[PDB]
Design a protein around this motif. Structure first.
Motif, PDB file in Angstrom:
ATOM      1  N   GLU B  64     -31.934   0.358  -8.938  1.00  0.00           N
ATOM      2  CA  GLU B  64     -30.457   1.233  -8.610  1.00  0.00           C
ATOM      3  C   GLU B  64     -30.258   0.840  -9.419  1.00  0.00           C
ATOM      4  OE1 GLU B  64     -28.140  -0.473  -5.517  1.00  0.00           O
ATOM      5  OE2 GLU B  64     -27.202   0.585  -4.737  1.00  0.00           O
ATOM      6  N   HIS B  65     -29.029   2.345 -10.033  1.00  0.00           N
ATOM      7  CA  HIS B  65     -28.223   2.421 -11.101  1.00  0.00           C
ATOM      8  C   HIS B  65     -27.096   1.153 -11.109  1.00  0.00           C
ATOM      9  CE1 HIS B  65     -30.867   5.948 -11.071  1.00  0.00           C
ATOM     10  NE2 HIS B  65     -30.924   5.762 -12.306  1.00  0.00           N
ATOM     11  N   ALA B  66     -26.583   1.435 -11.760  1.00  0.00           N
ATOM     12  CA  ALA B  66     -25.036   0.836 -11.948  1.00  0.00           C
ATOM     13  C   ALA B  66     -24.798   1.723 -13.103  1.00  0.00           C
ATOM     14  CB  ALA B  66     -24.832  -0.214 -11.673  1.00  0.00           C
ATOM     15  N   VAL B  86     -30.422  14.421 -20.772  1.00  0.00           N
ATOM     16  CA  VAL B  86     -31.807  13.885 -20.687  1.00  0.00           C
ATOM     17  C   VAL B  86     -32.071  14.099 -19.855  1.00  0.00           C
ATOM     18  CG1 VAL B  86     -31.801  11.985 -20.626  1.00  0.00           C
ATOM     19  CG2 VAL B  86     -33.245  12.140 -21.997  1.00  0.00           C
ATOM     20  N   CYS B  87     -31.300  13.944 -18.702  1.00  0.00           N
ATOM     21  CA  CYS B  87     -31.957  13.727 -17.114  1.00  0.00           C
ATOM     22  C   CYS B  87     -33.396  14.466 -16.705  1.00  0.00           C
ATOM     23  CB  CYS B  87     -30.712  13.767 -15.847  1.00  0.00           C
ATOM     24  SG  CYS B  87     -31.080  13.032 -14.507  1.00  0.00           S
ATOM     25  N   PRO B  88     -34.230  14.223 -16.273  1.00  0.00           N
ATOM     26  CA  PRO B  88     -35.238  15.278 -15.952  1.00  0.00           C
ATOM     27  C   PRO B  88     -35.166  15.621 -14.717  1.00  0.00           C
ATOM     28  CG  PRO B  88     -36.431  12.887 -16.734  1.00  0.00           C
ATOM     29  CD  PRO B  88     -34.641  12.751 -16.913  1.00  0.00           C
ATOM     30  N   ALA B  89     -35.169  15.147 -13.736  1.00  0.00           N
ATOM     31  CA  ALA B  89     -34.607  15.587 -12.441  1.00  0.00           C
ATOM     32  C   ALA B  89     -33.312  16.415 -12.830  1.00  0.00           C
ATOM     33  CB  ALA B  89     -34.651  15.139 -11.128  1.00  0.00           C
ATOM     34  N   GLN B  90     -32.215  16.542 -13.144  1.00  0.00           N
ATOM     35  CA  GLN B  90     -31.111  17.409 -13.758  1.00  0.00           C
ATOM     36  C   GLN B  90     -30.056  16.325 -12.806  1.00  0.00           C
ATOM     37  OE1 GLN B  90     -30.195  21.122 -13.711  1.00  0.00           O
ATOM     38  NE2 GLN B  90     -30.334  20.777 -16.227  1.00  0.00           N
ATOM     39  N   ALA B  91     -30.656  15.105 -12.416  1.00  0.00           N
ATOM     40  CA  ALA B  91     -29.254  14.460 -11.546  1.00  0.00           C
ATOM     41  C   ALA B  91     -28.049  13.690 -12.203  1.00  0.00           C
ATOM     42  CB  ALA B  91     -30.004  12.663 -10.635  1.00  0.00           C
ATOM     43  N   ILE B  92     -27.538  14.245 -12.844  1.00  0.00           N
ATOM     44  CA  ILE B  92     -26.638  13.868 -13.524  1.00  0.00           C
ATOM     45  C   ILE B  92     -26.472  14.792 -13.429  1.00  0.00           C
ATOM     46  CG2 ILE B  92     -25.313  12.673 -15.241  1.00  0.00           C
ATOM     47  CD1 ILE B  92     -27.368  10.751 -14.383  1.00  0.00           C
ATOM     48  N   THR B  93     -24.622  14.229 -13.023  1.00  0.00           N
ATOM     49  CA  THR B  93     -23.724  15.846 -13.215  1.00  0.00           C
ATOM     50  C   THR B  93     -22.465  15.183 -13.410  1.00  0.00           C
ATOM     51  OG1 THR B  93     -23.274  15.269 -10.912  1.00  0.00           O
ATOM     52  CG2 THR B  93     -24.995  16.805 -11.472  1.00  0.00           C
ATOM     53  N   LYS B 115     -32.782  12.313  -6.030  1.00  0.00           N
ATOM     54  CA  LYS B 115     -33.554  13.455  -7.284  1.00  0.00           C
ATOM     55  C   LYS B 115     -34.503  12.946  -8.272  1.00  0.00           C
ATOM     56  CE  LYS B 115     -30.567  17.060  -6.912  1.00  0.00           C
ATOM     57  NZ  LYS B 115     -29.115  18.165  -6.728  1.00  0.00           N
ATOM     58  N   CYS B 116     -33.717  12.237  -9.047  1.00  0.00           N
ATOM     59  CA  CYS B 116     -33.753  11.304 -10.654  1.00  0.00           C
ATOM     60  C   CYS B 116     -35.025  10.190  -9.640  1.00  0.00           C
ATOM     61  CB  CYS B 116     -32.697  10.624 -11.001  1.00  0.00           C
ATOM     62  SG  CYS B 116     -32.733   8.969 -10.302  1.00  0.00           S
ATOM     63  N   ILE B 117     -35.826  10.178 -10.689  1.00  0.00           N
ATOM     64  CA  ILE B 117     -36.951   9.792 -10.568  1.00  0.00           C
ATOM     65  C   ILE B 117     -37.595   7.983 -11.033  1.00  0.00           C
ATOM     66  CG2 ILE B 117     -38.665  11.828  -9.923  1.00  0.00           C
ATOM     67  CD1 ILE B 117     -37.968  10.357 -13.621  1.00  0.00           C
ATOM     68  N   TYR B 118     -36.227   7.975 -11.691  1.00  0.00           N
ATOM     69  CA  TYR B 118     -36.287   6.541 -12.092  1.00  0.00           C
ATOM     70  C   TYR B 118     -37.086   6.353 -13.872  1.00  0.00           C
ATOM     71  CZ  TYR B 118     -35.123   5.955  -7.972  1.00  0.00           C
ATOM     72  OH  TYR B 118     -33.728   5.856  -6.312  1.00  0.00           O
ATOM     73  N   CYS B 119     -36.602   7.477 -14.100  1.00  0.00           N
ATOM     74  CA  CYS B 119     -37.143   7.152 -16.453  1.00  0.00           C
ATOM     75  C   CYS B 119     -37.035   6.344 -16.326  1.00  0.00           C
ATOM     76  CB  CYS B 119     -37.650   8.562 -16.403  1.00  0.00           C
ATOM     77  SG  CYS B 119     -35.440   9.663 -16.456  1.00  0.00           S
ATOM     78  N   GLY B 120     -35.576   6.222 -16.398  1.00  0.00           N
ATOM     79  CA  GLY B 120     -34.857   4.851 -16.861  1.00  0.00           C
ATOM     80  C   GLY B 120     -34.829   5.938 -18.962  1.00  0.00           C
ATOM     81  N   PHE B 121     -34.646   6.599 -18.683  1.00  0.00           N
ATOM     82  CA  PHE B 121     -34.228   7.827 -20.136  1.00  0.00           C
ATOM     83  C   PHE B 121     -32.511   7.649 -19.800  1.00  0.00           C
ATOM     84  CE2 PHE B 121     -38.329  10.655 -19.867  1.00  0.00           C
ATOM     85  CZ  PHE B 121     -39.087  10.455 -20.103  1.00  0.00           C
ATOM     86  N   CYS B 122     -31.829   7.302 -18.813  1.00  0.00           N
ATOM     87  CA  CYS B 122     -30.648   7.343 -19.398  1.00  0.00           C
ATOM     88  C   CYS B 122     -30.313   6.266 -20.045  1.00  0.00           C
ATOM     89  CB  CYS B 122     -29.672   7.152 -17.595  1.00  0.00           C
ATOM     90  SG  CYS B 122     -31.272   7.507 -16.330  1.00  0.00           S
ATOM     91  N   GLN B 123     -30.714   5.038 -18.874  1.00  0.00           N
ATOM     92  CA  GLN B 123     -30.190   3.793 -20.391  1.00  0.00           C
ATOM     93  C   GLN B 123     -30.843   3.510 -21.569  1.00  0.00           C
ATOM     94  OE1 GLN B 123     -32.571   0.721 -17.703  1.00  0.00           O
ATOM     95  NE2 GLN B 123     -34.373   0.934 -18.984  1.00  0.00           N
ATOM     96  N   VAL B 132     -26.831   1.941 -16.084  1.00  0.00           N
ATOM     97  CA  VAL B 132     -28.636   0.951 -16.079  1.00  0.00           C
ATOM     98  C   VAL B 132     -29.112   0.968 -14.887  1.00  0.00           C
ATOM     99  CG1 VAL B 132     -26.668  -0.073 -17.048  1.00  0.00           C
ATOM    100  CG2 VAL B 132     -29.482  -1.014 -16.969  1.00  0.00           C
ATOM    101  N   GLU B 133     -30.326   1.122 -14.932  1.00  0.00           N
ATOM    102  CA  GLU B 133     -30.510   0.697 -13.748  1.00  0.00           C
ATOM    103  C   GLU B 133     -30.699  -0.881 -13.417  1.00  0.00           C
ATOM    104  OE1 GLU B 133     -33.746   4.613 -12.810  1.00  0.00           O
ATOM    105  OE2 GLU B 133     -34.370   3.147 -12.856  1.00  0.00           O
ATOM    106  N   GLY B 134     -30.311  -1.071 -11.894  1.00  0.00           N
ATOM    107  CA  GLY B 134     -30.370  -2.559 -11.766  1.00  0.00           C
ATOM    108  C   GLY B 134     -31.308  -3.088 -11.111  1.00  0.00           C
TER     109      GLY B 134
END
Ligand SMILES: COC1=C(OC)C(=O)C(C/C=C(/C)CC/C=C(/C)CC/C=C(\C)CC/C=C(\C)CC/C=C(/C)CC/C=C(\C)CC/C=C(/C)CC/C=C(\C)CC/C=C(\C)CCC=C(C)C)=C(C)C1=O
Ligand SMILES: CCCCCCCCCCCCCCCCCC(=O)OC[C@H](COP(=O)([O-])OCC[N+](C)(C)C)OC(=O)CCCCCCCCCCCCCCCCC
Ligand SMILES: CCCCCCCCCCC[C@H](O)CC(=O)SCCNC(=O)CCNC(=O)[C@H](O)C(C)(C)COP(=O)(O)O
Ligand code: SF4
Ligand code: SF4
Ligand code: SF4
Lengths: 85, 176, 115, 115, 155
Positions: B64-66, B86-93, B115-123, B132-134
């Motif tokens: 889970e993100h935080a 960089v979001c592969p699923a375009q979940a970030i808005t 949507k997002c698939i927990y790639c971790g690219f965002c962190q 960052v995913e918790g």
């Protein structure tokens, strides 16, 4: 009980009545489907559809395209069924 | 090189034939299986009872993100939109705005956890370690809407799991 | 240039031919699917839908094009008589749930900015 | 007395079990729930068409086999006779013949599946 | 009071359901393989009462786990319609929670809920074999908290 040309006469004409669009006034021996009766080649298809299952034969598109006048059917299924009397 | 696997022609000596005949008549490989399972019956089950004890993880686990915030209390996210880019699923808005103080924060940070698939690219993306995913793999909800997180929920997750994210990132900030 | 490789048909006429036995097959095909697929429409309500596609597909003149969709129609017919499709797939032809869309300009103007 | 009392008691208990099973649970039937199961998709439509199984030949032979298992069942009482010489010969005849019938049944294909 | 006996019969019925719900054998994609790890000896789903029975005629909870697409959506709803009442559908994984990675493609229905009344949503890509292990137990709490007869005695 073999059938005659008059036996076809009614029966080809009979199966033509069932089609809804064809007008009861515009039927004739020589009536043109496309011009007089006012059909389209698509509409020419199913009046053939009504016609072989009613009599009980099978007519391919090799010959089904120019039988358009009602008697053009009669003189055709006469030779297909060999009704020559 | 290569090794042939199965063409072993059996011997036809009377000892070998009787061995195979005994095997077929007096089922042995079937008994070999039964003795196997019985031996594998008196072992110690590999199960763990649920939540009373839980499975083992690693500090770099993804969940889970935080949206964390600086030691002062100011949020890390300066809204550089890298995570969205960089979001592969375009979940970030996200949309930003010049805040009242003049700083550069984001008005909206809806993360769609459906949507997002927990790639971790965002962190890996934001150069301020903002998103960052918790370690919390557990946030299952009863309604679809609850999963669609906004900025407010992200900050709440940041305020709740902050002890874990500080410790986990402290462990793995050297490997990256 | 103008010279192009034809698929099966060699001019309009037999291209016009191929659309016929597709209609020949489709027409024979309607009543049994209404029974087999347990459809809600009438036997009459299937022939028109079979029909109306055909002169919906009437502006087409290129012989290669005509032969191209007669294969698509044959394939659609193929995937129908082996119950490969389902009730939903067939019913998708009947635009049922989708509410009627206006046609007049004034109604277009009332609903939203779109042509 | 006892035997049909035992028989009656068992069918009664079973009837109550299905009765409370089929009545109590607050049914809700909506047609597609009662539709036949076909592994997720619709049935092709039959299930009463003749399921031509290939063990027909082995089927009737089993009937003939059972007809002679009834013959060789009185052996426990047949052994308590005064003429075991005759009883042993005739007994071994049945098993020899039963093996012989199977042997012909085996050698001339028979037991093998029909493909 | 009739409320007491209704509540006691209430607790008896649901406890049977929450301790004996049988997840169907309904796997789709990447989200299904790790769900086997839940059934693997590590977590041992069966210890919590569930059994992985096939045949939706004999199943309670449907684990929609994987990408739900166009070509199969009729098959699923036929399957769901076949399941007797009560029936629950846990949307498992991000693909079945709205479309997942392929939310924007052309042959995926964006969300399992658009075909089925979807119960508790377990997220993850994939959710850990433990992540929805809570998802199953959290449904057992939902089964615990129902009223049913309580509404009937007050209907
Ligand atoms: C495609 O995707 C898939 C998955 O995921 C989507 C999966 O995960 C997995 C992995 C999961 C697994 C568990 C692996 C195995 C699963 C499979 C599907 C593989 C195929 C399975 C088999 C070949 C074996 C199947 C075995 C089964 C079903 C076991 C059967 C036996 C049992 C003992 C278990 C069931 C027990 C039951 C139901 C309990 C008892 C039954 C009752 C009715 C209760 C008792 C009732 C009464 C007593 C009646 C009431 C009367 C009373 C109280 C008496 C008093 C009152 C009176 C009035 C008299 C797989 C394989 C998969 O392929
Ligand atoms: C051995 C078992 C012993 C205990 C059995 C208890 C009864 C269980 C019956 C099945 C569930 C229905 C029930 O409890 O009451 C029926 C009642 C019937 O009245 P109802 O109106 O509540 O039914 C549900 C709502 N409709 C009618 C729209 C379907 O239903 C419920 O309690 C379910 C809510
Ligand atoms: C329940 C659902 C059942 C299934 C429902 C229907 C399922 C789909 C059926 C097939 C639909 C497909 O798009 C079209 C096809 O197969 S073929 C088009 C034939 N196109 C031509 O032939 C050239 C243009 N048209 C003309 O030349 C004439 O105008 C015309 C032929 C119309 C009348 O001929 P007339 O001599 O003028
Ligand atoms: S974890 Fe990956 S897919 Fe999910 S929101 Fe972040 S960047 Fe996008
Ligand atoms: S969360 Fe990270 S990547 Fe996204 S806008 Fe903030 S700093 Fe940039
Ligand atoms: S949610 Fe992720 S793991 Fe599950 S099926 Fe979709 S892509 Fe695969």
């Amino acid at each position: 009980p073999p059938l005659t040309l008059e036996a076809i006469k009614d029966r080809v004409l009979y199966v033509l009545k069932l089609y809804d669009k064809i007008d009861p006034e515009k039927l004739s021996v020589n009536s043109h489907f496309m011009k007089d009766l006012g059909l389209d080649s698509l509409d020419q298809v199913e009046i053939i559809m009504a016609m072989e299952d009613e009599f009980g034969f099978e007519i391919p598109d090799i010959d089904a395209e120019k039988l358009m006048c009602p008697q053009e059917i009669v003189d055709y299924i006469a030779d297909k069924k060999d009704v020559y009397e | 090189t290569y090794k042939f696997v199965n063409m072993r022609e059996p011997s036809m000596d009377m000892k070998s034939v009787t061995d195979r005949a005994a095997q077929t008549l007096l089922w042995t490989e079937l008994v070999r299986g039964l003795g196997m399972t019985l031996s594998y019956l008196f072992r110690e089950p590999a199960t763990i009872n649920y939540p009373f004890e839980k499975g083992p993880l690693s500090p770099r686990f993804r969940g889970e993100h935080a949206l964390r915030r600086y030691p002062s209390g100011e949020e890390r996210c300066i809204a550089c939109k890298l995570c969205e880019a960089v979001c592969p699923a375009q979940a970030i808005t996200i949309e930003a705005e010049p805040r009242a103080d003049g700083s550069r924060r984001t008005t909206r940070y809806d993360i769609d956890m459906t949507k997002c698939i927990y790639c971790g690219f965002c962190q890996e993306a934001c150069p301020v370690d903002a998103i960052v995913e918790g370690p919390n793999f557990e946030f299952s909800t009863e309604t679809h809407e609850e999963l669609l997180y906004n900025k407010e929920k992200l900050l709440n997750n940041g305020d709740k799991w902050e002890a874990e994210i500080a410790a986990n990132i402290q462990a793995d900030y050297l490997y990256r | 240039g103008t010279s192009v490789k034809p698929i099966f048909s060699r001019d309009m006429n037999e291209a016009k031919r191929r659309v016929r036995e597709l209609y020949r097959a489709w027409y024979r095909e309607v009543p049994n699917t209404v029974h087999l697929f347990q459809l809600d429409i009438s036997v009459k309500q299937g022939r028109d839908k079979v029909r109306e596609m055909f002169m919906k597909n009437a502006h087409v003149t290129d012989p290669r094009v005509v032969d191209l969709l007669v294969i698509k129609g044959k394939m659609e017919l193929e995937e129908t008589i082996n119950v490969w499709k389902q009730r939903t797939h067939i019913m998708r032809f009947f635009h049922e749930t989708e509410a009627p869309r206006p046609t007049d300009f004034l109604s277009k103007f009332y609903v939203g900015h779109d042509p | 007395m006892n035997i049909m009392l035992t028989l009656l008691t068992n069918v009664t208990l079973a009837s109550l079990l299905v009765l409370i099973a089929f009545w109590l649970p607050q049914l809700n039937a909506y047609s597609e729930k009662t539709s036949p199961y076909e592994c997720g998709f619709d049935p092709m439509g039959s299930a009463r068409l003749p399921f031509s199984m290939k063990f027909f030949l082995v089927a009737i032979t089993f009937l003939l086999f059972d007809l002679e298992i009834a013959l060789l069942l009185p052996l426990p009482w047949a052994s308590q006779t005064n003429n075991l010489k005759t009883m042993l010969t005739m007994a071994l005849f049945l098993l020899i013949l039963l093996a012989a019938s199977l042997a012909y049944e085996w050698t001339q294909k028979g037991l093998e599946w029909a493909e | 009071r009739g409320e007491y006996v209704v509540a006691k019969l209430d607790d008896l019925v649901n406890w049977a359901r929450r301790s004996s719900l049988w997840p169907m054998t309904f796997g789709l994609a990447c989200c299904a393989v790790e769900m086997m790890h839940m059934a693997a000896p590590r977590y041992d789903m069966d210890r919590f009462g569930v059994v992985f029975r096939a045949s939706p005629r004999q199943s309670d909870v449907m684990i929609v786990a994987g990408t739900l697409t166009n070509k199969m959506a009729p098959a699923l709803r036929k399957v769901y319609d076949q399941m007797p009442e009560p029936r629950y559908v846990v949307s498992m994984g991000s693909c079945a929670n709205g479309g997942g990675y392929y939310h924007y493609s052309y042959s995926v229905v964006r969300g399992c809920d658009r075909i089925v009344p979807v119960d508790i949503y377990v997220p993850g890509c994939p959710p850990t074999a433990e992540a929805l292990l809570y998802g199953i137990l959290q449904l057992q709490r939902k089964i615990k908290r129902e009223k049913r007869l309580r509404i009937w005695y007050r209907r």
